[PDB]
Structures are given as C-alpha cells and as structure tokens.
Design a protein around this ligand. Sequence first.
Ligand SMILES: O=C(O)C(=O)/C=C\C(=C/O)[N+](=O)[O-]
Ligand SMILES: O=C1C=CC([N+](=O)[O-])=C[C@]1(O)OO
Ligand SMILES: O=C1C=CC([N+](=O)[O-])=C[C@]1(O)OO
Ligand SMILES: O=C1C=CC([N+](=O)[O-])=C[C@H]1O
Ligand SMILES: [Ca+2]
Ligand SMILES: [Fe+2]
Ligand SMILES: [Fe+2]
Ligand SMILES: [Fe+2]
Ligand SMILES: [Fe+2]
Lengths: 359, 359, 359, 359
Amino acid sequence: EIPKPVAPAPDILRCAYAELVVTDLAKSRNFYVDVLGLHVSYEDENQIYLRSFEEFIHHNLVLTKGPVAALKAMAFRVRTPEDVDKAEAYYQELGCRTERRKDGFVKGIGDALRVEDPLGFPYEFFFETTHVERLHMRYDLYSAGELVRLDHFNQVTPDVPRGRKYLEDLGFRVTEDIQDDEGTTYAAWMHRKGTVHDTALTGGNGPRLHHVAFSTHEKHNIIQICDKMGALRISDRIERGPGRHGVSNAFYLYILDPDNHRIEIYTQDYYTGDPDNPTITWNVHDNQRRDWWGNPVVPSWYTEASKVLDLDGNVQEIIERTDDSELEVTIGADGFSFTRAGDEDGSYHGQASKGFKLG
Amino acid sequence: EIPKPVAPAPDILRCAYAELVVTDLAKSRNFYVDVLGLHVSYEDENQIYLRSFEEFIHHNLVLTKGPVAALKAMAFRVRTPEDVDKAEAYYQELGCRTERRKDGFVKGIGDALRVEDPLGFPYEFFFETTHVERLHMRYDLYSAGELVRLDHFNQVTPDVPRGRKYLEDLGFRVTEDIQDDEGTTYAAWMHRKGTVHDTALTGGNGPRLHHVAFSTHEKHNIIQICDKMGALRISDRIERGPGRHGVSNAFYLYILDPDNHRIEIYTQDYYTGDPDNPTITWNVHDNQRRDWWGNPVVPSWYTEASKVLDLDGNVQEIIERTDDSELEVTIGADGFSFTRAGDEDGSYHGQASKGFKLG
Amino acid sequence: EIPKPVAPAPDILRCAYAELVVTDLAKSRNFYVDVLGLHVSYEDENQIYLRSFEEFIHHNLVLTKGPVAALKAMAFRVRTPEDVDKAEAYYQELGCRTERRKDGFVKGIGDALRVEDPLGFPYEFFFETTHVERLHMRYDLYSAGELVRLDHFNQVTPDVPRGRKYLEDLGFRVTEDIQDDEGTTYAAWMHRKGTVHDTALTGGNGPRLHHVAFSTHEKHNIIQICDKMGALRISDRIERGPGRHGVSNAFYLYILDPDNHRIEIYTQDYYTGDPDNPTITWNVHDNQRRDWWGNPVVPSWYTEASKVLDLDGNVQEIIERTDDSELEVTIGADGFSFTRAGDEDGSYHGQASKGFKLG
Amino acid sequence: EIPKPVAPAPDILRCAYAELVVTDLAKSRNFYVDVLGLHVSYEDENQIYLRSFEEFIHHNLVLTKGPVAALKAMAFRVRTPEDVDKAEAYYQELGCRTERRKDGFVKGIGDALRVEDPLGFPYEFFFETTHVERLHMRYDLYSAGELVRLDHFNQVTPDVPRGRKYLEDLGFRVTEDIQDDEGTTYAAWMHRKGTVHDTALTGGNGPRLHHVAFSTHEKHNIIQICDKMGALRISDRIERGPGRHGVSNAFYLYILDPDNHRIEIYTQDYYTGDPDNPTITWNVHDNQRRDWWGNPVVPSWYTEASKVLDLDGNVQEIIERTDDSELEVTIGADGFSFTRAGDEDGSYHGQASKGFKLG
Ligand SMILES: O=C(O)C(=O)/C=C\C(=C/O)[N+](=O)[O-]
Ligand SMILES: O=C1C=CC([N+](=O)[O-])=C[C@]1(O)OO
Ligand SMILES: O=C1C=CC([N+](=O)[O-])=C[C@]1(O)OO
Ligand SMILES: O=C1C=CC([N+](=O)[O-])=C[C@H]1O
Ligand SMILES: [Ca+2]
Ligand SMILES: [Fe+2]
Ligand SMILES: [Fe+2]
Ligand SMILES: [Fe+2]
Ligand SMILES: [Fe+2]
C-alpha cells in the first residue's frame, strides 16, 4: 500500500521525546514531577519540559496546556543535520503534509520537521538540541523509583502489516511480533537504537497513542512506583502490572496520568543491534506472550489510548480495525488462551486467566 | 466461646514445620525441590524432609505419601522440654484429643504432642529436634529464588473472633485484622516470634489449611520464582501475585503445588515483638488492604483451601461459615470496594478492580 | 569477675535508642536528616529526635547539643513497667550507680532508669514511651537509601570475657564470637530480640562506643548511601565497606558522622530466637571473618571509637586493653591472616589482604 | 603516528568473543562453568566454548589448552561479510601481519581475519557465526550470579594517545578518559555498540590484556559472585571490589581465573549512541574517578595483566611506558589524591585512601 520512496530514508538514532497535550498543567506537574520524579529542564504557565536521570538532550517529555488531551508529536533524533533534509524529501515523495521550522517547534530543539505520516501520526525529525547537565551520577537527587531513560513509544493502528512495511522502509528493524495460525497480525515491535524497540504497533482503532515508556535501573525501582502510588492512595491509576513481559522480556508497569495518557515503566530487555538479530513471533492465544506469568491483560489496555493531533492542532479521525481483535480472540466470550499449546489444563475459554472474566 | 484454661500455656517460640500429605511423591518432590529449591534433609519412598536455606532444625516441611492430600500437622516449637508437658495439660483442660509420642511423629523430631485443637486443626508442639548443617552462608548452593525461612501458616475457620480469643489465651498476639463497620471480622494475624505472624485466621468454611509461607531475602527472589515458572511453562500454577500486601506490608506470591496445596512466598514485613505493638485494623471494603496496588484478589484465593486430618488420619468434617463472606462483600455481585474512603472515583460496585468480574 | 545478683534480671526486649552528644547541632542535622533521611519526631535548638522508617516508639536516636561529643546513653526497652524496678534492684545489688526519673531523661520516654554499668557504660532501661505514626507504609517518604530499623550498638571494652559473662547474667545470649588458639577472645555478639545481636563487645581501650547500626530492606539501599555520599563529594566519610560480614552474615557499611561517631548500615542477618541457637566461633586470623570477601579491615576501625559519659555528664576514664590486639595480630607488622586454614596460598604476613600495608 | 588508511574501515558492531589460552582445561572449566555459570556451546578435550545468558551467536569465550596462559584473540563482529574483506585491506595498508581463514579459526565462526594490530594485539574480525538457542528467557537455568552479556575488553598499552587515534580512525568513539593538568593521558574508553565501551586502553607496559568484562542484570547479581567465592573459600581470587566506578558509572567487581586472567563483572552504565555524546574527562588525582566511593585501587590492578600472543602463538614482547604511572602519581610514595579538589581534608599524600599504604 505505502510504496518505498526513491529518496533515501533519514538515519534515525532513537526515540527522543513526546509532546503531550494536557488539560491542567498543575495536576500534570504533580504527576510527572511529584509522583514520578522527572527532572524539570524548563517550565512556564503553558509548558513543562522534563528529562530522565541519564539524559543529556534538552528533554524527553514536553507537556503543553490545551483544550483537548492528545499526542501532539512523537520525536525521533536523527544522526546529522542533513538527515532533517532527507526526512523532508522522504515524506514529500510519500505525499504527506510536512512542516519545517529552522527554529524548532518546542524549546530546546533547533531545526525540525513535523509530518502527518501515512498512518496519521504526527512524527518529528530533528538533530539540533540544547545539551543540559547529564544527571547520571547525581545520586543526591536519585529517587527510589528513578526514571533513567526514554525507551520507546507504542502506536495503535488498524492494519499492522501496512504500518510495519512502512516503518521497515524507514529503517526500523522488527524484533518480535504476535500473529495467529490464520495469518492475522496483532502487534509488532521495531527498533533503531539496539533495544527491543523505539516504537511499536498495536492493532486497533487508529491513529491513537497507546503509551510512552521510560526505563528504570532495576526491578525494585518499578516496585517502588507501585508502593508510592499506594501510599498517595492513587492505586486506581495503576492500570496493569507490574509484571514480566513475554514479548521483549522486560519487567513492566502501566500507569495513567491525569488525562489518561498511559505511561509504561520498563526495564531489562535485550540487545538487538546485530543485523541478523533473531526474530520472535508469538501466537496470540499464548497466555505467556504479554504477561509471562500468565496474569490477565486488563481490558482497558486493549481499548483505551490517547487521541492524536494533526499539524493544525486538530484531533485525527479514527479509522476502525477490521482484522480480528486481540481482546476478543483471547479474553472475550469466544476467545481462548493457553499455558501449554494443545494442553487443555491451564487454558481459558471465554474468559481471562486467574479466574476473571471481563467486567 | 473457648474458655481460658487454669493451666499455663506452653511458651511457643515460632512456627517450625508442616507435614503435608501428597498423592504422588515424585511429582511433589519436583515442585518443592526442583522448582522451589528446598534442601532435602532426608527422603525415602514414603516421605521427603525439606528445610530452608537458614534453618538449623531438621526440617520445615514433610511431604508424606497418602491417599488423600491434606494437612497432617502444623507444628510449633516450644521453648523447653517442659513446655511439651504444659501443652498436653493445656489441651486436656480444653477438652481436646491429644496424642503423645516420646520419640516423635516424624523423623528429626523427638518428644512431641499432637492435638485436635478447638478449631479442629492438627497442631504439634515439640522441643527436641535433630540439628542439621545450617546453610545460611552456603552461597555455593544459593538459588536465584532461594527460600530462606519458614514464616507462617494461614488457617480457614468459620468463626474468627472465636479462634482469635483461643489463640490470644494460648499467647499469640494479634498484630493486624480485617473488619467491617457492622461488627464482622473477616481475618486476623497473630505472632510469637516478633514478625507479623506465625499463624493467621481467614474467615471461611473450615477447618481447611489456607497456605504455608516461606520467606526470601529480597523482592527480586520472588520475581525469579515467577520467571522460572514461566520458563517451565507452569505459569498456570501461579495463583495470585506477585504484589505488596496491605496487611503486613510484605511482598508476596501465591503458587499451587500438584495437590493444590497453596504456598506463599513472602518478604519484608516489620518487627512486632514489643508487647504494646500497635494493632492495625483495615476495613474489608478498602481495595488496598490485601494487595496495596489495588490488584484484584483472585476468587480461588477465597474459595479454595486444603483439607486437614484428624489424629486417625481421616479428613476433618467442614463447618460452613455463617458470617459475611469477604469474596461477596468486595468482589461479588452486591460487593463494593474503594481506593479512597468516601470517594466514588476509584470505587468498584458489583465487580473486581482493574476491569474484571468473577469468572 | 562480675558476680551474678540474687535479684532477677530485667526482661529486656531489644535495643531501642541511643543518645549522642554532638558539638554542632545544624551540622549533625544535615548528616542524619539530609544525607541519611532519618525522620524527625521532635526538634528544637538543643535536641533532634529521629526515628527509622518502621519505628512506632518516639525515636531511635537523640542528638543532644553539648561541649564534648560522646555517648550519653544507650537505651534498652523492657517488657513491663515492673522490669524498670527489677533493673534498679539488679544494678544496686551490683554496686553500680543508678538514677531513676519517673518522667524520663529525654522527651518521649516515661519512667526511666539510667546506670553506670560494671563496664563504665551509661545504660538506660524503660518501658513507657510516646507512640508515634509508624511510617512503614509511607512510601511517599521512602528514600533510595531508607533506614528501616535500629538494629544494635557495639561497645569497646578491654576484657571481653568479663563483659560477656555480665551480659549473659543480664539475659543476653551470645551468638557469635572471635577467639584465637591461645585463649584470647577478641569480640562477642549477643542478643535479646532474635537477630544476631542487640549489643556486642569489641576488645580494645574502653569504655568506648564503637557504633550504632541501622538496617535497610535490601542490599541496594546500602549501595545508594555510598553512591549519594560520592555525589555529595563526602566519600571520605565512608570509613569501611560496603561488604558482606563473616560474623552475622549481614551486608554492611560503616560511615562517620560530623563528630566521628561511627554509624553502621546493616541488612539480612539470620534468626536466633530458639534457645539452642548454634553458636559460631571464628579464629581471629581467618581473613573471611569480618569481611567475607577478604577485603581488608581499615585500621581506624580498630583504633577509633567514641567517648562515653558518666551520669554527671563527664567523660568516662579509659582503661587500656592488655589482651592481644586484633589489629596487631592480623594486619600489623608481625600479624597474620589466612584464606584457607592451613594453606600458605592466600595468606598474608605483616600486611593487610589485597595488596596493602598500613599508613 | 599511526596514519589513517585510505581503505574504508570495516563496520564494527561490537566486541564479540575472546579466545584465552589456559594451562589446565579442567580447572578453567570449574571456574567459568561451575563458579561463574557460563553456558557450554561446545566442548572437547582441548577447548571450551562458552556464552552468556542473552547471546545468540555461537560463543562469547573460548578456553584453549596450551603451554602459556595468554590472550590469543579478541574478536569483534562486523556488519556484513564484505566488512571482513575491508578489514584485511585496511590492516594490509597499515603494514600489519594478517591471516585470513574462510572457515574460521575456531568452531562456530566462519570467514575470519586475524591480525597483529599496530599496538601488538591479536584482533579478529568476522561476520559469519553459528546461531544457537538464545537463553534470555530460560529462567530455569538462571543463576543468582548470572552473566548476561559480554560487555568489553580492556587493553594495557604504553602510549594511550597513539592507541586512541588508531581506534578512532577504526570508528570507535571516545566516551570518557583520565588525564592530568601537565597533559598526560592515563586511560581512555571507546565504543561502537552504544554503551560506554567495547574496548578500552589502560596506560602501562604492553601489549597486555587487562581484562574481559561480562554484564549482569542487577547489582545483587555481582554481590552473589562475591558471596559464592567466600563460600568456596576462594576470596583471595577476588582482586578488587565490588565498587561503583566513577568513569562509566557502572557497578563492578574484578576477579582472577586459575591462570590469573582478570574478569570484570559489570552493570548499569549509560547510553552513548548519539554522535555528539558528551565526553567526560576526569583528573588523575580525583580519588572518585576509579571507585566513586573513595576505596583504594589495589596495586596489582595497575601492575598485573595478561600476556598476548602473536599469530604464531608466541608471546608478544612488552614495551615499557615512559609516560607517568597512574599508580605512582596517585598512591605511590610521591603521589596524591583528593576527595574535593583543592581541599587538603580528604586528601592523601604518599599513600592510598582508607588508611592504607602500598604493600
Ligand atoms: O560487629 C558489627 O559491626 C556487626 O554488625 C556484625 C559483624 C562484624 C563487625 O562489626 N563483623 O566484622 O563480622
Ligand atoms: O513494551 C512492551 C513490550 C512488550 C509488550 N508486551 O505486552 O509483551 C508490550 C509493550 O508495552 O509494547 O510497547
Ligand atoms: O501473608 C499474609 C499477610 C497478608 C495477607 N494479605 O492478603 O494481606 C495474607 C496473608 O497471606 O495471610 O497469612
Ligand atoms: O569498565 C571499566 C569502567 C571504569 C573503570 N574505572 O577504573 O573507573 C575501569 C574499567 O575496568
Ligand atoms: Ca457496612
Ligand atoms: Fe511498551
Ligand atoms: Fe500469608
Ligand atoms: Fe555492628
Ligand atoms: Fe572494564
């Protein structure tokens, strides 16, 4: 569907920051800085610029006050200045709306391209950025739940193979995926920096942003987040987890900000930088693929995701998935999942694992 | 009401071991030894004797081959040889059936008393025991999921207040409980050794044994047990967890052995040895009381538990609870739970937390 | 030989708090509160009262402004009010000075007895204390190096067997000790609460206070204290560690406060509550006894310790040890230590392990 | 002084494996397999092939029986089969001895080029390697001390700047170095894979191999290695640590194999893949540069290192450093180090930190 341009792909380094529209800047500030302990690079009455403990670029998260909570841009750092020109020609050849600012769209970023990409997502490409104090040895500042890096984004899109091919052309390498025996793809993970992923597609009504993911050093740092959320009596904002993922093998947690933007806390996946890095495909009915301990996937995880904006700041039209639903085929009334393939013991039919059905 | 005897209670030091009857010895061995890493002190075609990493007494668990899987004895060590006589007098005055074996009921234990207690539970009291090599610095043997001590038992009984009074008289001090505003007690925790408990009472049809708990050093050790069960493709034997308890504050996991005896893995509760240790009462509707992160309590946790035997080796008849059911008042069709008292937001009506209903 | 009184010992529960005299109260506040994260129960111009994360009694540590930095009192909590009576009668029979104050010596303590004990140490015994908010679930307050309990004191005294027998009559049970093949005892560890110790004797010139130890939950919380002191550029106040102890098997770290009072951080020793708990004796020349990894023991650890005060607030006269010196016999010019008993390989003559002499 | 070739550099992915010659195969196997838990990919009477938990290529270490313990090859994987031709051309232009084997030098490596590089080190470049089962989710085989990846090499060489420029032409990017005000360089670290390093240069008599480094997931894994070595009564084989590095910010430990080959265990350094990644220069006298906590650097760490072999299997002649010795300027009789720059308090003159002097 999406052809490969003749123009060369920009050389993408890694996911770098997201810009999220939030409704109430103070309430968001409490969440990101007071609960989560992210580091303020800059803030005013309109925006809060936040970085992780080990980051030296200006920010990993920008929160912008607005009327409608949404993703405004997912940004990728490119290797050279010229790569911003290479990105522009690329998305031009594709027929996508693009916007170039030599001065950047946000503080702490220089020359940048924003695009409405083929999947309806607002991507940013940029090289130039304001270096700040790298806080990686500032143990006087370290919190028990310290967020040390931006790791990845996850995008909800109807047709996964279509998006996958397009990301592949752009230079992302696919590391794992979820399929069924009848040829349906439910999800795919792909990378540039040599971790399991820098972004990922999740099958579903799209464009929507599923989540943004930050890394911690150790599993006990993720346990601390949960513990702190209990003490602040906000455990209702813990959406799902903690657990160990099947796909990626990372220890994980999903939480929800004031505007229901989903944040993932993530640690200890594996190295993927070799070009013949072996791929891993999971069957959708495998009850260890998402939570390795067989714990049930929370139904909100499959249905809820953030709005995304176009370049005029307007919410993008959602298109409905027509391929089968992961929720439905695993935990819905006609779904099933298994612990050992072909074994009736430890399998679930028409309900989730651990004795639950959908609420 | 169980009367306080005139006879002095045995000075109980701690929970010491449990004797569990199992149907297939070889399968059971694979779980406790090969999966969980417990250390064999003795075995034959009929029994397996197992101790934790820091134990010096002969064993913490005895698996005994039998035709019906059940708790045969929950054993407590007492401070002196003389306390065994005390225990016999005490139980006789209560009108209970007792049996005394000067050379013990199981290997590695000397003079012992077993009783059918007023709650219908098979308790043992002993002092004499064969000292073995204490493995506390045998780091050459240390597993990534190493089980380091026996921590507690947990008992299902229909009338908690009644059992509580009897256990206080016996010298246990209640450290935490769960109650509602209408007079109902759903569970109680009680100790001798200065941790949160040596046993506890869980409201339900009983006598049934709810679980036996072992401790790890660190939270990562419990994570590894989950990870290993995932690798062995027996995640369906993970019943509930891992999580942070409210009551007790401990990190925890619950897993099911081949006869569905429930085992808890536990770490990092607090010191309770001062005689005026503050008692903590939780409301039964508080959705952070069992799992602090608010994850739903799996239904089987409330409905399933092991049979217990009398002194003749027959299963004790089960007496139904008539008091309110914790399951029903919190996660049942007319149930209710809350995150913040008096707040509707993050409350649950007629269902479980995180988007689930009972399957 | 200190005689055994006819009067019964008081029932001691555990070590409870220390009172340290400090010379600059602001400078000390910065260390114990800002660096270490101790929680303030009460403060004014003259005194700071601090508790650990899991404590429900008023405080574990009192910092008292004064002219000469010293130990003012090491306090042990007793099981009942009448144990303070037993304590007074006990020490009086011993011929020791006593002072009783019905309203206590520091805020938050009630009826209290302080004594100049047979070894020159200021011991306190009390029962009454003001209960405070137990912060054990206050994870919104939890530091990456959080101190969770008061664990023990360690005293320096010239004649270890003499002190040992006195502490034994007083109800403490020896757990581990250090001796040589010539009859000399160098150190002894003894307890009431069922951990390795509540106090301990280190041979040397005394009465002096070697240290006060606080516990953490996990090994990484001790690592963080080190990492924080690095980031505050006060690494010169890390005296020794971190490491794994041979004796006690605890993970450990020694640091120095503004007045050189030594503080230990400690986690994960083993259960000692059974009366036949197997005692362990190490040879003084075993290079794994103090640090299990063989790392050398810093000479200041052997030579430096705090002054103690008598009941009139004057520094106790120091009596010189004549028994052999641990320092000299192990790491001095004619000292010796071994890795494997009998083996010349991995032994050290006239120097420290790992390639070092003493400066 | 090493000129840049006109021939394009091979595209280097990462350090891949080391081949070490050992004198007693059986004893070396005990150390690497039974003590350290590395995984066998192939073994016979002459050689052991070992890999780390997360590796998919054939091996990360080859132990080769032979007369003199030494490094035989340090191998880097390249991007494409063609990069092997490029490396041959590159080194031929340098005037270095080369040897090309189309079916490789060791099992499970295909087309390979070995060389005697300008510093005298036997480098290998390959692309082709036999894929093996990636053990990253094999938690049934995970050890409490698990080694999860090969992270880096560290080479000892007399002229750090000379070596630095040659590695830079070869595509390695410098991340951190150690220098003094007089203009001497003592040490430099350089990468390809996006971590602090794939190889490093330590100033000293060379060519020697300083160490081979493996990563763990968490800091506790490294503490387990030290605990297990105390239990095996081989703590004398613990050379240095465990510690937090200043350079790299990684938690670390140095141990010694039966042939005195040094192994580093290492975790949690930071991301370096952006092309403008800030370089960090430390002053040689800063006592927090090597151990962040101020612990002394063991002198053997500076003086001892492994012989390396030329292409005929003969040991390479060692050239003496004429630049200043890091040992002598920091811990030698004329050296010094500081905690805070310019502050004499926490400074050390003519000795090491923590009250120690050179052995
Ligand atoms: O004595 C302590 O300090 C302690 O906590 C336990 C043991 C100890 C030294 O102090 N040790 O070196 O083994
Ligand atoms: O981070 C992730 C990796 C694995 C995964 N999953 O559920 O296994 C989902 C996930 O959230 O996708 O981005
Ligand atoms: O270990 C326990 C402590 C707390 C608890 N719970 O679910 O809170 C249950 C529990 O399992 O009872 O013994
Ligand atoms: O790997 C490292 C990192 C830093 C370092 N150092 O002494 O700081 C030495 C090495 O062996
Ligand atoms: Ca009610
Ligand atoms: Fe994710
Ligand atoms: Fe329990
Ligand atoms: Fe101590
Ligand atoms: Fe290194």
